[PDB]
Every structure is written in structure tokens, then in C-alpha cells.
Ligand binder design. Structure first.
Ligand SMILES: *P(=O)(O)OP(=O)(O)OP(=O)(O)OC[C@H]1O[C@@H](N2CN(C)c3c2nc(N)[nH]c3=O)[C@H](O)[C@@H]1O
Ligand SMILES: C[S@@+](CC[C@H](N)C(=O)[O-])C[C@H]1O[C@@H](n2cnc3c(N)ncnc32)[C@H](O)[C@@H]1O
Lengths: 171, 695
RNA sequence: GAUCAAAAAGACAUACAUAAAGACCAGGC
């Protein structure tokens, strides 16, 4: 799910950045440090919408860096268990299709695939086609999955999905 | 044995041929009793039917003197004793490539530049024709590297060899574009075993080769089959007999009429091996037995070389196919096929027999001297061939082989290699956007005959091939980086193309399967051959052949390369007949406009490119009196029915002058589309304008 | 028939972590 929230940051500026372009450097430093990052509390920071206010810089004692508190509006992506989102199976791996939900990866265990969807290695591009055929379930297809669980390993989040409920699968 | 009475070593080689076979080609009724099955003979000492007994015993004795010697001691003496040993592989992957370089010189370039019976070249590098060849039992394809390097991309090779340590090392073709070669391992294609002796591998390869050659076959076959006979070197002929037969059967299976064949053989003492050479002498205009100086002088290795495959060889092919089935049935039995032609038939041709004996006895005499020379160079380690470096330099000069080391290509980055391939052409030429076709720009497609058109399915990109899977794309803007292409496909080095990426949907809706494919729009450089100044259709003719050259039909896991279907602008009506409304996977059940190709695949079109193929001041008219198109020069007022060289639009004019008719929402090009936007050109508007301006 | 490699500067591969604690005793300013 996509959200629009207000977040904070402390920008530690190396002393070289001082001088004329000081406030501008803080904004440029902010954009580079938060965009693309991910956390467990808020998830993937897609982009900074607006910078509300820049706090007065406070010299940190014993270190050169001076910390500017910053208030900004950002777009974040935070998945939840039970939510259905449209995903593309980048990799039709035999153990499970690998589906990239936007910037976040999601693994759908083969055990969570209806029994009618047999895996077919001999097909030209590999796919878990339905046993007759019906649904190829291969690369570039759009599918509906239910997120069953989430994990955060080294600031990056990944999820596990399932296709057991009705009206899920090929789109 | 006095080995010092040998002629001075030379780069000049002599060829003696068999006479021309004056007998008819044997038929199924004549050959009906020729296959004699007997006891399995593993004795070579009494095979005197085509060589004097004293010479046969002398060469066998001179071979067996080495059975008690250390192989590294023998190899070191041989390296000093052979005048030709310093030739090696030069810059090629092995010394086998240099045998093909040597023999293609000695045989008047008949392999790399084959000729008709009137002496005219069968392949012209400027015309749409490729040199098709095959290379069997040939891993790791050293012979192939020389041919591919010599002809660049103007060639397409087909390979079959046993899977294993001696498979094709296509990665090691440093001097040639490995993308122009296609290994095929018999039954199952890429997943087969490559057993030449097995018939099914021959059959699947046979159907595949004929299909990939417009049902004509290859211009020539090369065959370098052999295996280890360590501690049984005297039995090498008898042990390899089925491999010899299967390589000859392969020649009669896939070489075209007037085509050529070259096969490695060893000794040729047995009536079985001589009967196989007799069948080739019947089936070809000319045959010879030849030992190149790049073959080691003390080994039994020689080549049968056949020129001009006759018409009507089908019965001899189907006979040899039945003999191979019989050999396979007799495997691990006390019985074997001992004759394939009766001795009375072979000896009835006195002219064939007199050549066969003289070829064997001359080879034995030279091999005996060369074996005695190696033995002397084992006993005395101070002996050396002083001329090896001189002879090497002369052979390389004579055969037109550059004296350079084998260097791994160099790794160029795609930007530096693009600047090398464009040869100082202005980079801004690659940044030009197409002119949009609109009611305000419609007049630009006049005169209609100057133009070609093609259906687009993605944005246009440049593509550079650096060899194998080192393929990069670029979107024509100087700010953009070269991006590595994430597709399972292979292209020769020194390749520069104008392309799009098209996903080909198969079926519809849930069952629909879409596969992305490289679609060539135009070509600039093909494996180091510049084609940019050739006429658009002529450039496309070279481009079309290239797609087949890089094709891999045994590899259904690879992403396909295709050339776009090019229409004449006065025939754009033929495009709309291939537009269909299809249910695409994920379109919520809404049909989408789809262009269906030459196969059962379609893509969603984005629009139509219109490309000018005639340069100013020229233009194409239609003469109502002569019912022919003509070129008209607007400056001189001259008219001609032949193509003026200065009327040719080169790549940069074709690219700069291109229009694009986008097919977005509100555009009617198929009768099921509603509603139409009145500010946008329909099919009916563009066809009406074209019809008014055809006359 | 094709082919036929030599062990890559070792860095306490690093914290020198022997430095028990605990105790009493002696001396220094
Ligand atoms: P190729 O394998 O056919 O021959 P090559 O060019 O490699 O030369 P080489 O094997 O070294 O020797 C030349 C010929 O002598 C026979 N040999 C090799 N050898 C080790 C050996 C041979 N003969 C006997 N009786 N005993 C031996 O121990 C080769 O087969 C060549 O004909
Ligand atoms: C030494 S090579 C020839 C070299 C090759 N012409 C080149 O230039 O690289 C002989 C090849 O014959 C192959 N061969 C032997 N028996 C074969 C068989 N029954 N089927 C297919 N290939 C075979 C061997 O595997 C071997 O690779």
C-alpha cells in the first residue's frame, strides 16, 4: 500500500559543505540519503514530496558534523498481511515464482499454488502452466497475490504470498 | 632407412588427382550384393590389396619401434624433426585451423570461395547470399574458426560433434564471430549426444541442415573425425572404419549438387576403406588423396578431397545408410562388414586402382623416412631442423595468414567500440527523432515510390554486439549510457544494428504466452563488414541473411532475432490485412490491435515507420507507357530504368528522413476501432493520399 | 586425430589476551 506521511531526519553535514550554498546542500543531501532506503517502521521511501521546515543547525560536540533536523513529506510503501496487490512474476523459479511488487520482492511458495497449476520445465519459456494449459503463469504476467508474511533483512523488506484463495492468480 | 635422402622442405605443395570417373553412379540394383559381411578382422599386416607387402610391413615395423619409447621423449624428437612444426595454430584455437588454411590455399579457395562449373563464384559478398558450410566430428571447431574468420559473417556454419571434453569450444573462437555457428547434436537438437555413427543424430541433423539451406544443402562439408587408439596405432584404420563411412554418408546427405567435401582419413589399405573412396569417386566430378604439410609427416593422417557433387547420388547415400545400420547391428559381434564395393569392381577400374596403389606406396615411403628421422632425433638430441622459422614465414605469407599471436579480444567497452565502428561519422546522426506523420506532414511521403514502410512494436534503439552474450543497447541520446541487453541471445563481435524489442504473444487471454524478440529495423555493420552505404533493401538483404546466420533453432531457450517485414509504401494496404483484434493477457478482456507476423505470433503495434530509400535529387516515377518504375533526376532532368549509384539512400539519409505514423487512441486502422479522433490520420486518409499520388 | 597447467610478497592469517584475581608487606611524594 502507498502512503503519504510526514517524516523527520537529522542531516549531518561535513564541514566542507558550509559556505554559500548551505541550505540548498541540506535539501540535496536529504534527497540523496532517504530516497531508495527502506526501514521496518515505515518501509520503502519512494520519494520526498515536500520539505516542510528546516530546523536550526546544532553543532554536535566533539565532532565536526552539525545536525539540521528536517521535516519532510514522503511517499512510502508498507505491505500488510492479507492485502492483495498486483505483482509480476519476474522469475518463474520451480520452488516458487519470484514476483516484484513495485520495488519490493515477494516470493510465492509452490505449496501455495493450486494443484491444477503443474510446473512445466519443457515449455519453451519456463512456466507453471495449468495442467491442460489454460494459464501459462510465466514471465511478464500480471497476478494477484495475498501477502502472508513480511520480513526485514538489512533494511530491505521481502514478503511471502499465497494463491489459495478464490479470485487470485492470473489477471 | 636413409631419411637424409629427403627433398628440401618447401611451402610449395603438389596435388595429384584421381582421373575423372567415366562410369555411371551405381544404382540400388547394382549395389544390391556389394555389402559383404564376414568375420571381424583385426589384422592389418595382410591388407596388401592396394599396397606392396614390403612397404606395408616396413611402415608397421617403423611405427611399432615407438611402442617401447616414452611419449614425451618421442614428442620432443618429433618437434625437432618436423620442418613444419613452428606453424602450429598461429592466432587460431588449434593447429587444425591451419590445416584448413593450408588446404583452402592448395585447392584454389574452393571452400571459402566455391565456384560453378563455369568458374563463377557461387556466393557474392554484396548479394543477399551466405556461404553455408558444415563441420562434423570437428570439436573444438578449429577448422571452423579459420573459415568463419576468413569469410567474416558472409558465412553460416552448422556443427555436429560428440558431447564431452572434445565438444565445440565456441567461447575460444577469438579470431571469429561464434554467433555465425550453430552446433546441433542429432536427435533432440541441442540436448542430443552428437554421435555421428548413430543414424538418428545423422537424420535429425540432416533434416535440420537441409531446412537451414533453402532445401539445397551446404556448399561444402568438412570432417575431422578421429579418436584415441593409444597402444593400437597400427589398427587405426580398422577401428575408425564406421566413423569414416558415417562422414562420407554425411557428405552425400547434406552437400549440395556442385558442392565440395573434405574428410580426414588415416591408412587406406583395407578393401572396406578403398571401396568407400571408390563410392566418393563415383559421386563427385573430381577426387584426390592429399597430405598437407600442416599434417605431421610421420602419421597416417591424410585428407580425401572431393569437388563437384554429381546429380543422382541418392541410391549411394541410401546404400551407405543401410551399411551403417548393419555395422550398428554387428557391434560387439564376431562378424563385421568387410566390403562395401566388390574387389573385382574396384580392380576393374584400372585408372582408379593405379592411383590408389601409388597414393598408398608414396605415403608409406614418406612415412617410413619420417619415422626413421624421428628415431634418429631420439638417439641424437643435437639434431635439429634449421629452416623451421623460414618455412613458417613463407607458408603464412603464401596462404595469406597474418603473423600475429592469439589474443583474447580485447575487451572493448560498448562506447569506445561504437566510436570505432562509426569511423568518425557525426554522433548527432544517431540522435535524430522521426518526423510524426500528421495531416500537416502527409505531403512529405511524396513521391510514394521513394518510400518503404514497416510496423513498429517498441521504441527504436541502437544495438552493438561485442561477441557472444556481450550485447548492449543505446537510445540514441549522447547523455544515455549503453545498457547490457537482458536477453538470452548471442551476436558476433563488430555488429551494429538499428533495432526495437518486440514481445510476441502466442495464443490469447489466460493461455496467451508472450516472448520478447529482437526486431532489426536497419543495419550499419555486420561482423566488421560495413553496409551503411548500400541501398536500404540491399542493406536489408544483407540483414536478412545475418538473422539466419545468428539463428539457433536447436536452442528454443534463446530469444529470437528477426528482420522487420518491409513493405513498399504503394502496398501499405497489405499491412492492414494483418491487423487483428486479439484478447491479450491482462487487458481485462478488452481486445487490442495486434499485428500478426510470418509465424503464428503477434505483437501490439505502436505505429508505422516510413523510410525514404531514394536520395535527392533522384526520385522514382512510374512509366505508364513502359509499365515499369524509373529514376528521375530533378536537377539534370535525366531518366533511367536502372538504379543510379547516387540515387541510393545510405543509412544516415534513411534514418534522418524517417517518418513515424503513431497508432495511439483515437486512430482508426482496423474496422473494429471506435471512436475516431478527427484531428488524426486514419488508414482511409493515408491510403487515399497514397492512391492519388501513385499516378 | 585435438590438447597437455605450478602451487602467486606468509603478514601473531595480526589486539603481543603472559599480564591469575585476591591478599598482605615494604618504600616513594
Ligand atoms: P595421429 O595421432 O594419427 O598421429 P600424430 O600426428 O599425433 O603423431 P604420433 O601419434 O605421435 O605418431 C605418429 C604415428 O605413429 C603412430 N604411433 C604413435 N605412438 C605413440 C605409437 C605409434 N605407433 C606404434 N606402433 N606405437 C606407438 O606407441 C601414430 O598413430 C601415428 O600414426
Ligand atoms: C581431433 S578432432 C578434429 C579437429 C577439428 N577439425 C578442429 O579443427 O578443431 C576429431 C573429432 O572427431 C570427434 N569424433 C570422434 N568420433 C565421433 C563420432 N562418432 N561422432 C561425432 N564426433 C566424433 C571427436 O570427438 C573429435 O572431436
Amino acid at each position: 500500500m502507498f502512503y503519504h506521511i510526514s517524516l523527520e531526519h537529522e542531516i549531518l553535514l561535513h564541514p566542507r559543505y558550509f559556505g554559500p550554498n548551505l541550505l540548498n546542500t541540506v535539501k540535496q543531501k536529504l534527497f540523496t540519503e532517504v530516497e531508495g532506503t527502506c526501514t521496518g517502521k515505515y518501509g520503502f521511501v519512494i520519494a520526498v514530496t515536500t520539505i516542510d521546515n528546516i530546523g536550526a543547525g546544532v553543532i554536535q560536540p566533539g565532532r565536526g558534523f552539525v545536525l539540521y533536523p528536517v521535516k519532510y513529506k514522503a511517499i512510502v510503501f508498507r505491505p500488510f498481511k492479507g492485502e492483495v496487490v498486483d505483482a509480476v512474476v519476474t522469475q518463474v523459479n520451480k520452488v516458487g515464482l519470484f514476483t516484484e511488487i513495485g520495488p519490493m520482492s515477494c516470493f510465492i511458495s509452490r505449496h501455495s499454488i493450486p494443484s491444477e497449476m503443474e510446473f512445466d520445465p519443457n515449455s519453451n519459456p519456463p512456466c507453471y502452466k495449468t495442467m491442460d494449459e489454460d494459464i501459462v503463469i510465466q514471465q511478464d504476467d500480471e497476478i494477484r497475490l495475498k501477502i502472508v508474511g513480511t520480513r526485514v533483512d538489512k533494511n530491505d523488506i521481502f514478503a511471502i504470498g499465497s494463491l489459495m484463495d478464490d479470485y487470485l492468480g492470473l489477471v | 632407412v636413409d631419411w637424409r635422402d629427403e627433398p628440401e622442405p618447401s611451402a610449395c605443395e603438389q596435388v595429384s588427382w584421381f582421373p575423372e570417373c567415366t562410369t555411371e553412379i551405381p544404382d540400388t540394383q547394382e549395389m544390391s550384393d556389394w555389402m559383404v559381411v564376414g568375420k571381424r578382422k583385426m589384422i592389418i599386416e595382410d591388407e596388401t590389396e592396394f599396397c606392396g607387402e614390403e612397404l606395408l610391413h616396413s611402415v608397421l615395423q617403423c611405427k611399432s619401434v615407438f611402442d617401447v619409447l616414452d611419449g614425451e621423449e618421442m614428442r620432443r624428437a618429433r618437434t625437432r624433426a618436423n620442418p613444419y612444426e613452428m606453424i602450429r595454430g598461429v592466432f587460431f584455437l588449434n593447429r587444425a585451423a591451419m590445416k584448413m588454411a593450408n588446404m583452402d590455399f592448395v585447392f584454389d579457395r574452393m571452400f571459402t570461395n566455391p565456384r560453378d562449373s563455369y568458374g563463377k563464384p557461387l556466393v557474392k559478398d554484396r548479394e543477399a547470399e551466405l556461404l553455408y558450410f558444415a563441420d562434423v566430428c570437428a570439436g573444438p571447431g578449429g577448422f571452423s574458426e579459420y573459415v568463419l574468420w576468413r569469410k567474416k559473417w558472409h558465412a553460416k556454419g552448422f556443427g555436429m560433434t560428440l558431447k564431452g571434453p572434445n565438444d565445440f569450444k565456441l567461447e575460444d573462437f577469438y579470431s571469429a564471430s561464434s554467433e555465425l555457428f550453430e552446433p546441433y547434436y542429432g536427435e533432440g537438437g541441442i540436448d542430443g549426444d552428437g554421435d555421428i555413427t548413430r543414424p538418428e543424430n545423422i537424420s535429425a541433423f540432416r533434416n535440420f541442415v537441409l531446412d537451414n539451406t533453402d532445401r539445397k544443402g551446404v556448399h561444402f562439408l568438412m570432417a575431422d573425425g578421429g579418436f584415441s587408439v593409444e597402444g593400437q596405432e597400427n589398427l587405426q584404420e580398422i577401428l575408425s572404419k564406421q566413423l569414416l563411412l558415417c562422414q562420407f554418408l554425411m557428405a552425400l546427405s547434406i552437400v549440395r549438387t556442385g558442392g565440395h567435401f573434405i574428410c580426414k582419413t588415416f591408412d587406406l589399405f583395407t578393401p572396406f576403406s578403398v571401396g568407400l573412396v571408390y563410392l566418393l569417386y563415383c559421386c563427385f566430378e573430381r577426387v584426390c588423396l592429399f597430405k598437407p604439410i600442416t599434417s605431421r609427416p610421420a602419421n597416417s593422417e591424410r585428407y580425401v578431397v572431393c569437388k563437384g557433387l554429381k546429380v543422382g547420388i541418392d541410391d549411394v547415400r541410401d546404400y551407405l545408410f543401410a551399411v551403417n545400420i548393419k555395422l550398428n547391428q554387428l557391434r560387439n559381434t564376431d562378424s563385421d562388414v568387410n566390403l562395401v564395393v566388390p574387389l573385382e569392381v574396384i580392380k576393374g577400374d584400372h585408372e582408379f586402382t593405379d592411383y590408389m596403389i601409388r597414393s598408398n606406396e608414396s605415403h608409406c615411403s614418406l612415412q617410413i623416412k619420417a619415422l626413421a628421422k624421428i628415431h634418429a632425433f631420439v638417439q641424437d638430441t643435437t639434431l635439429s631442423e634449421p629452416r623451421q622459422a623460414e618455412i613458417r614465414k613463407e607458408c603464412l605469407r603464401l596462404w595469406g595468414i597474418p603473423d600475429q599471436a592469439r589474443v583474447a579480444p580485447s575487451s572493448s567497452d560498448p562506447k569506445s567500440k561504437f566510436f570505432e565502428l562509426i569511423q568518425g561519422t557525426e554522433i548527432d546522426i544517431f540522435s535524430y527523432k522521426p518526423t510524426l506523420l500528421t495531416s500537416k506532414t502527409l505531403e512529405k511521403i511524396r513521391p510514394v515510390f521513394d518510400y518503404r514502410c514497416m510496423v513498429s512494436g517498441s521504441e527504436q534503439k541502437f544495438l552493438i554486439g561485442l561477441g557472444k552474450s556481450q550485447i548492449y543497447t543505446w537510445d540514441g541520446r549522447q547523455s544515455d549510457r549503453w545498457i547490457k541487453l537482458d536477453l538470452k541471445t548471442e551476436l558476433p563481435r563488430d555488429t551494429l544494428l538499428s533495432v526495437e524489442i518486440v514481445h510476441e504473444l502466442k495464443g490469447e487471454g489466460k493461455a496467451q504466452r508472450k516472448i520478447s524478440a529482437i526486431h532489426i529495423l536497419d543495419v550499419l555493420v555486420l561482423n566488421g563488414t560495413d553496409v551503411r552505404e548500400q541501398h536500404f533493401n540491399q542493406r536489408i538483404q544483407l540483414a536478412e541473411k545475418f538473422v539466419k546466420a545468428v539463428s539457433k533453432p536447436s536452442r528454443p531457450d534463446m530469444n529470437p532475432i528477426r528482420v522487420k517485414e518491409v513493405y513498399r509504401l504503394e502496398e501499405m494496404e497489405k499491412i492492414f490485412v494483418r491487423l487483428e483484434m486479439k484478447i491479450i493477457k491482462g487487458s481485462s478482456g478488452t481486445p487490442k490491435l495486434s499485428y500478426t507476423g510470418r509465424d503464428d505470433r503477434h505483437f501490439v503495434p505502436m505505429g508505422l515507420y516510413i523510410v525514404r530509400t531514394v536520395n535527392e535529387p533522384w526520385t522514382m516515377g512510374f512509366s505508364k507507357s513502359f509499365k515499369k518504375k524509373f529514376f528521375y533526376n530533378k536537377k539534370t532532368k535525366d531518366s533511367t530504368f536502372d538504379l543510379p549509384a547516387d540515387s541510393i539512400a545510405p543509412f544516415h539519409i534513411c534514418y534522418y528522413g524517417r517518418l513515424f505514423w503513431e497508432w495511439g487512441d483515437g486512430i482508426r486502422v482496423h474496422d473494429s476501432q471506435k471512436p475516431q479522433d478527427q484531428d488524426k490520420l486514419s488508414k482511409e486518409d493515408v491510403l487515399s493520399f497514397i492512391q492519388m499520388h501513385r499516378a
